[PDB]
Amino acid sequence: MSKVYVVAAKRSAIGSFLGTLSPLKPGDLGAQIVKNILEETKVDPANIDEVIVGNVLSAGQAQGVGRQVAIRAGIPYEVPAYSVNIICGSGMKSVITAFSNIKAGEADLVIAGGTESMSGAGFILPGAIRGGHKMADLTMKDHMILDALTDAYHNIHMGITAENIAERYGITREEQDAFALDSQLKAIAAVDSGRFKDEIAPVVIPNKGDIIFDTDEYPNRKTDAEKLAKLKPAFKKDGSVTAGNASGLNDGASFLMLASEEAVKKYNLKPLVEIVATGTGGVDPLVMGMGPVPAIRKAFNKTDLKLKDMELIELNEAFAAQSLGVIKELCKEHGVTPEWIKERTNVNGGAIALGHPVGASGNRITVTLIYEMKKRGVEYGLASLCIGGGMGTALILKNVK
Amino acid sequence: MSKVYVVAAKRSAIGSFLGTLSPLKPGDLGAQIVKNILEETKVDPANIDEVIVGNVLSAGQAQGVGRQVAIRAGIPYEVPAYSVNIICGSGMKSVITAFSNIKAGEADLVIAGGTESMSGAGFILPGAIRGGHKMADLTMKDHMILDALTDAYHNIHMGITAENIAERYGITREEQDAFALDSQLKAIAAVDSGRFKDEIAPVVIPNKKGDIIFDTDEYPNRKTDAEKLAKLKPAFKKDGSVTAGNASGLNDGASFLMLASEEAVKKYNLKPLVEIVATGTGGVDPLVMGMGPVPAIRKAFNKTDLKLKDMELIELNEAFAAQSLGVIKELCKEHGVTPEWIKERTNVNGGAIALGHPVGASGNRITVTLIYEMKKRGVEYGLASLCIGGGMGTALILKNVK
Amino acid sequence: MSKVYVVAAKRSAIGSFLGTLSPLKPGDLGAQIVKNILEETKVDPANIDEVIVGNVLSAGQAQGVGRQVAIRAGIPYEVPAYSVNIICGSGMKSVITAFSNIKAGEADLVIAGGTESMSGAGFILPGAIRGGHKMADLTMKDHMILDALTDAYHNIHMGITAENIAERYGITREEQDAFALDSQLKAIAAVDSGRFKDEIAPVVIPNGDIIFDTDEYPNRKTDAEKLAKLKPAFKKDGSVTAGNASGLNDGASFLMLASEEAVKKYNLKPLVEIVATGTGGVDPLVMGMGPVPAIRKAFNKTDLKLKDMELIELNEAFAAQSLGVIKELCKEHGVTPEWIKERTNVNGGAIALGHPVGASGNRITVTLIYEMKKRGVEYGLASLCIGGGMGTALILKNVK
Amino acid sequence: MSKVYVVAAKRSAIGSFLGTLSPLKPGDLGAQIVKNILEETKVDPANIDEVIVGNVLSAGQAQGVGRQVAIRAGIPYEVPAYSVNIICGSGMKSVITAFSNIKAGEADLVIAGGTESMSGAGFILPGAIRGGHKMADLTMKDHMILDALTDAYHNIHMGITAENIAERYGITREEQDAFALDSQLKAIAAVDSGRFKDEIAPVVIPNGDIIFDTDEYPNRKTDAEKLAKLKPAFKKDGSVTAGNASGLNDGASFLMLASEEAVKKYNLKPLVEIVATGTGGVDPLVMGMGPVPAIRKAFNKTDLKLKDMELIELNEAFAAQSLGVIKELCKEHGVTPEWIKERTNVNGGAIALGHPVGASGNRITVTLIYEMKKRGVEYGLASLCIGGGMGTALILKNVK
């Protein structure tokens, strides 16, 4: 069984809701990132075995967002391409599946990622109209809210599951806003210092003049502890989750190229990192934010590594309440202190500041981890995120000098 | 690496467009079939590693149709479940990924299938109105037609890709209606003899009188014949050869396999029905999507010491008579078999023209139909494959576990 | 000032909701009725001064349903035609305006009526989306329910105003259901004895074409027990049901009105003379009471009393509403319930026949006129309540 | 018969499309103008006989825009109120009907105007959906474009009917753009000199509250060469552009009309007298010529000629439309184009000021009345073209 190497890694900068990326369909945005990876590695696209594309909001795009990403990037028709939907983890699950395909000898060279345009998601008139609607109010559902953000069993916003974690673990409003403010500060330092320059592929928004988008635009440079504390609850009366301590609604795409040992040698691709192990876990949908805890457990149990071996960590910031609850549980289970976790986690900022384009985030945070691993020269890094419906995914990565 | 066994296989009967299954959401429909598999095999759901569910039309269902299938089937929260969209091949790609996971040692016991309620698909107001729509008509797109049936590169219906194959490969209208009629006759024969009784899990639809039990494929057309088929008019192209009579229908349905490693079979005392020998995923020009089974079958066989001539039964999805005849013509040339040899063993209980084509589940559906006919006939090798919107195909090579 | 004469009167049969008239747009439906009136009177349409058309649910028809009625009936471009909306009174208010125009010498020959296709009314995405709709659900309003049936000041269905009348005036569920059953019986009797044959113009729905000529809403399979077992239609513990309220319906109705110079110059025998008109207002919360001030206003222009009426048409929007009106009218005008009952809605009413909102005001006038001619009575009164809290009324006098 | 006097006249400033008036519903906008009239005249609202309100885009407003105008202006329930739809003429036709009602002795005091929120008009899913829609795309029609701007017989935009007039009369692109520019200059002149101050009632938009009292549509950054470089807006190779056509606008406008008895009884001073009215019809394909039969029918009721008119308002639906009307009026009435243009639309017209469809026919009458008063002239004429091929006209006499 061949080791699995990451030989390329690029992401878009992340757009704000109705922001710079909002004109781009998800297939078109994703294709620009894959094309960037193709032009840099110079691999003949005909040698790719498959393209696997995380995508949640697929209504209105015509057949297969995933295949659109491949064809519009210049990958030939003979290379199959498709899409996967495990809500928030969709951009990491594509990688996990590519990992399995390479391990099982079913593939040697795979593009795996995710792409999401929450801006472009439309509104749904239910199919029950096909048989008729005699009278009264006709309600069209927001595709983004229902299909990416609404639990299918309790009909609650994901923000309610964040309140559930806050209430169950006693994570206070002030602790959530401290976490959120820190993530903003870390993101702004990373952006302004050029930290993201290597990992970001420029995206051109065709226009009256083409616009070039290359700098994350969601970080809030005009907030502070007092402003955060004065925000109103966003999801439930007298709740603690606000728009300031929750992640945003965003557009974005991100992809890896994964290669077997045979491919690395045959096509002279030099690995950035190795994927040591994967994990996918489930929890109660009502506290879906805790999904990283079984996911991380399953990934480590496939290795001789422990959480203490990780030197960098990316845990996606769906909600401050959710990440703090995850951190709290990770400490008890793995015998690390919260200060040890926090000092190495989301070191360049997280989704509260950078944004959460759902189908792409699981790949986004893996790209960010990879490039910071290389900069620091550390050996192991962990990436993981919670998933709507009560799941998580996780990747353990090892540096390849 | 472990062998990959099919230890369970069940499908719904296929519902007509706006027919018996139309009130059921795709996650509810799929869950009923997975729950049947769970009750028959008596496996503790907590020992399943993952549920992988093909599904194309996911709009308006709330988060993840895959997870809905698993949860509402009684599978614990700790078992992850999700969905895949490779259009028509979605119910077969899910098995192919389960096959990969087991070979890689990432999984031991997987439920993999697909579910699709074409009837319940809605209509899409585009997201550009979020920024405003100052004046003019506003068009809502049919979610079914656009997202399941419309090519994303040429903005043409799947039926137009059928015309392109009918033209390029010389498939006449008469040959298409012959294929279509024979498909009807074989399906009716299979339905009426009880041939599908083993493979179909009954589905309960809640109804005001009392609950409806649906267990009999309702799309086969018992009133058509050669002259009625010849009198139909072109459905997609002026002067074309493709009609509603020689094309598949719009349909609802679900279909699932349980896949097991060798450890799982021993640890859980599961009885393999068949073994999955190899898989194939191929690509072709979107303009001739129908030709997708050809590279996919080639890739599957290139992983084995088997040739197409080793197959005793074949299931090739009937997206369109023109598409299936075009595949047949090319398989014959490449693999050195006659058309007669193929047709005497392909879709022997009828195909999608008669039985229906619930897009995200057909890939799994035709595999369940293959498996049960292999058991009844006692043959060793069966092949299943189908084309895929956007120019792709998938294939499975199966071997009997007698 | 000229007297005002009704020289022609025709209505469509009334269709059920999504029923036989459902394919017809209101402009088209109204045009067939006006063209019937043109064919029978044989008046040159170029001699018509105006066409005035009641119509409530005008969304989605393109410019001016009233002008479509005239143009598609064969009335030349030079004859102006337009629409008026006073909700349920629209088909009578058009006649009342025609009466004004003739009295004032502004016109000599007018076609006035109304037309409504409740079946064809669609659903409304609100105009606020022009500026954008960032997120959350988007509700399209039912055009028919909102714009024909929903009060603009209290956001209640017209059914709630019927409940308000039942409460304030002590009108019981059983009284409502008795009134409703009687209306069904009289309507069925009238239909089946051919009493509406004279007034009804046949309508052709292109399809083979369908000829519609018989009111299809009356419920031939109901009775006191079934009506009593229905559940309230508009509020828990209420008395208004689908069975003692009118329905949702499609239909059109028209009259031709003429001066004295027109009657002479074109030799048209008046059916009746319009003696006086009335338009009244009440609280929108009890809109059904609207006929009470309208009837009072019409009579105060004459030396006539309510006791001089030999036939009455009071539209049956709801049994609660109609019984409430009857109670107040007996009081004000010194007549008994039994006296009103025996001469009011003698051929059935809207509970059985239906309520095509923009046309009913003309519809009940056409039914009154033809029963006046069969009975040879001198005076007939027509009136109906209006959404928003209004009523309209007409006093008619037979022409020997 | 009683004379008919205008005893009050007020209008909103006209809003741009999605501009300052866009948040106001048409009933609310109209009520604010009627309330201004009520507060200025200090008449007891209970003495009004009815309120008649032009309004075209009625969808999604709930029951009766006319009634909403009255109720929300503070007019009591007993005073009936309704709406009329003759497209572009609706705000003048309401007055014409008030004129008939007073003349006929059916009323003594009437509020008549129009109101339109083109910005607030929604989008229409068609009622055919009620019976089901098995598959394929679903189109929602723009309520504004279809029901106010689209011909019901040729399915063409009103801008196409302007092309037909320009082609049939040889009105050149350059002649149109000069008319348009002149209109902008006269409008800007009048706005900035305070000429409209008397006639405009301020409107409060609840967004701190906004006070809107200045016409915002006049284009102060256009000139001859910028107009010459605009693309055709309606047909390939055509002459009509966005710069020589009216705009999409919001606004309301009302008059109070009084009998001789009412003037005496309620101590009201007439501003002007309505001498005569006219309503005409023309071919829908050249609907913009509608003012020609309307004007002709109005003068033919009097001993006056077009030559007696000292001020004229003719609504500028399209420069092509208005030049064709002027060309035809000159031939029929024996006046020169120079004579007409020196006294027509002296404070600008709809190209610059905007065209709130249901209100414009009242708006141009309000603008005429106040300019009549400022100049002290005796006779003025207002007229406008109407979708579907009609016109309306009022002849006014100063009451000094």
How many domains does chain D contain in total? 1
- Residues of chain C contacting residue D283, judged by C-beta atoms under 8 Å apart: 77
- Would you mind telling me the total number of residues written for chain D in this entry? 400
The DSSP call for residue D218 is: -
CA atoms within 13 A on the CB side of C21: 35
Separation between Cα atoms, residue A89 and residue A366, nearest integer Å = 11
Residues of D in contact with C27 (CB under 8 A): 152
Distance CA A375, CA D167 (A): 73
- In terms of phi and psi (left: phi > 0; alpha: psi -120 to 50; beta: otherwise), the region of B347 is left
How would you class A226 by CB atoms within 10 Å of its CB: exposed for 0-12, middle for 13-18, buried for 19 or more? exposed
Which residues are CB-neighbours of A284 under 8 A, at least 6 positions away?
A390, B77
In a domain, B130, yes or no: no
- In C, what residues contact B, Cβ < 8 A? 125, 129-135, 138
Last residue before each break in chain C (C–N > 2.5 Å): 207
List subunits contacting chain C, requiring 3 or more Cβ pairs under 8 Å. Answer: A, B, D
Question: In the complex, which subunits touch A with 3 or more CB pairs below 8 angstroms?
Answer: B, C, D
Q: Which residues contact D338 (CB under 8 A, 6 or more apart)?
A: none
CA C155 to chain centre: 23
Compute the distance between CA of residue D293 and CA of residue B269 in angstroms, rounded to an integer.
95
A330 in a structural domain: yes
User: For residue A174, what are the CA distances in angstroms to A185, A244, A254, A317, C318?
Assistant: 16, 12, 33, 16, 59
Q: How far is CA C110 from CA A249, C313, C399, in A?
A: 62, 23, 19
B55: closest CA among B22, B89, B28, B32?
A: B89
Note the resolution in Å, 1 decimal: 1.9
Q: What is the DSSP letter of C207?
A: -
Say if the Cβ atoms of C137 and A140 lie within 8 Å. Answer: yes
**D399's torsion region: left (phi>0), alpha (psi -120 to 50) or beta?**
beta
Touching chains, B (3+ CB pairs < 8 A) = A, C, D
Query: How many angstroms separate the CA of residue D65 from the nearest CA in chain A?
Result: 21
> For the domain that residue C376 is a member of, what is the CATH number?
3.40.47.10
- A388 in any annotated domain: yes
Beta strands C203-205; B392-400: pairing state: unpaired
Distance (Å, rounded) from C-alpha D17 to C-alpha D33? 19
Structure tokens at C266: 């074109």
Cβ-nearest to D125 among C140, C281, C284: C140
Residue C163 lies in a domain: no
Q: Say if CB C118 and CB C87 are below 8 A apart.
A: no
User: Is residue D387 assigned to a domain?
Assistant: yes
Instruction: Tell me if residue A17 falls in helix, strand or coil.
Output: coil
Residue of D nearest to A129 (CA): D132
Tell me the nearest-neighbour CA distance from D193 into chain C, angstroms: 33
**Elucidation technique:** X-ray
- List the single residue in B135, B142, B250 with the smallest CB-CB distance to D142: B135
Q: DSSP assignment of C297-358, as one string? A: HHHTTSS--GGG-SEEEE--SBHHHHHHHHHHHHHHHT--HHHHHHHBSTT--HHHH---HH
- Cα pseudo-dihedral C39, C42, C45, C51, rounded to 10: -70
Positions of C marked catalytic:
88, 355, 385
How deeply is A236 buried, as exposed, middle or buried, from its count of CB atoms within 10 A (0-12, 13-18, 19+)? middle
Q: Is residue C302 part of a domain?
A: yes
Instruction: In whole angstroms, give the CA distance from residue C347 to residue C184.
Output: 9
What is the C-alpha to C-alpha distance for residues C317 and C355, in angstroms, rounded to an integer? 7
Residues of B with catalytic function: 88, 357, 387
Partners of residue A132 in chain D, C-beta under 8 Å: 129-132
- Our CA angle for D318, D373, D390, nearest 5°, is 30
Domain extent for D264:
4-120+248-398
**Does residue A46 lie within any of the structural domains?**
yes
Tokens read off for C217: 């809403």
d(CA C55, CA C87): 8
Counted across chains A and B, CB pairs separated by less than 8 A come out at: 251
3-state secondary structure of A187: helix
- Give the C-alpha separation, B157 to A26, whole Å: 21
Cβ–Cβ under 8 Å, residues C83 and C225: no
For residue A124, which residues of chain D lie inside 8 Å, CB to CB?
Answer: none
Distance from the A145 Cα atom to the nearest Cα atom in chain C, whole angstroms: 7
How far apart CA C206 and CA C210 sit, in angstroms, is: 6
Tell me if B135 is assigned to some domain: no
Q: What gap in Å lies between CA D148 and CA D151, rounded to an integer? A: 8
Contact A126 B125 (CB under 8 A): no
Lookup: tokens for C111: 């076609």
Cβ of B63 and A119 within 8 Å? no
D62 within 8 A of D122, measured Cβ to Cβ: no
In the DSSP assignment, the letter for residue A148 is I
Strands B381-388 and B313-316: parallel
* SS3 (DSSP) at C85: strand
DSSP code at position C144: I
Beta-sheet strands, E only, within chain C: 4-11, 15-16, 50-54, 81-85, 109-117, 123-125, 138-142, 203-205, 210-212, 249-258, 272-281, 311-314, 379-386, 390-398
CB D288 within 8 A of CB D390: no
Q: Do D18 and B134 touch (CB under 8 A)?
A: yes
Q: Read off the tokens for B279.
A: 């898989």
Active site residue ranges of A: 88, 356, 386
Cα A260 to Cα A98, A105, A174, A274: the distances in Å are 10, 9, 47, 10
Give the closest residue to D45 by CA, choosing from D103, D2, D109. D109
In terms of CA atoms, which chain C residue is nearest residue A140?
Answer: C138
| Cβ separation A130–B18 shorter than 8 A | yes
Q: How far is D374 from chain A (nearest CA, A)?
A: 49
